[PDB]
Amino acid sequence: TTDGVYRVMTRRLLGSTQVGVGVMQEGVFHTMWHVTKGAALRSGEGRLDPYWGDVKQDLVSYCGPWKLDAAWDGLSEVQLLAVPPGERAKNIQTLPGIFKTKDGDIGAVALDYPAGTSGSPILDKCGRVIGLYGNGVVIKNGSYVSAITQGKR
Amino acid sequence: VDMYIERAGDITWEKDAEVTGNSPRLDVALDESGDFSLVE
C-alpha cells in the first residue's frame, strides 16, 4: 500500500483479469473512473472505498481527495509508464500532440496499449505524474490517441 | 466480483528511454459521459 504504480485486477471463481492501473501517492489511490466505476478495492487485507470521482474527467480517487497536480509544460517530451496486462512496467517516451477543445487544449499521447493499461501514469522528466493514460479517441486510420488526463487537487 | 490492487513498480523516469509516437493535433469534443470524439 506504499507509494507506487499498481495493477487493478478482477477475479471471480477462476483466474484474474487486469482491468486497469493506478497510482498510490500521499495515501490516495488514483485511477480512471472507467476502470472501477467506483467499486471498492481490496488491498491485501483492507478495503479501499472511493472518495471522489468524475465520469466526465474519467477519474476516481480512493481514501482521500485527488492528489496529483503536476501539469504538462506544453512543450517537453513525457513518458508513459505503461503497466500492460501480463507485462512488467515499462517507460515509453513521446512528444505529446494536442486535443484542441472548446474549453482549451489538452496534451495527448499517440500511444496504443491494451485496455487494461488504462490508468497508467504519464510522467514529466522529474518523475511527477502529469496525468493518467487511457481516455481518448481513434483517428480515421484506427490509430489510438489518449488524453493526458489530470485531475484537480 | 473481487476487485483488488497489486503493486507493480516504482514511479520513475527512465534515462535513454525508447521514443515513439507522433504528435497529432486533433479537434475533439468531450461529452458529459467522458467520451472524446473527433469534430468532423
Binding site: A115, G134, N135, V137 | -
Partner: peptide
C-alpha cells in the same frame, strides 16, 4: 485501444 476510446 483494443475498443475505441478506453
Amino acid at each position: 485501444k483494443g475498443x475505441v476510446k478506453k
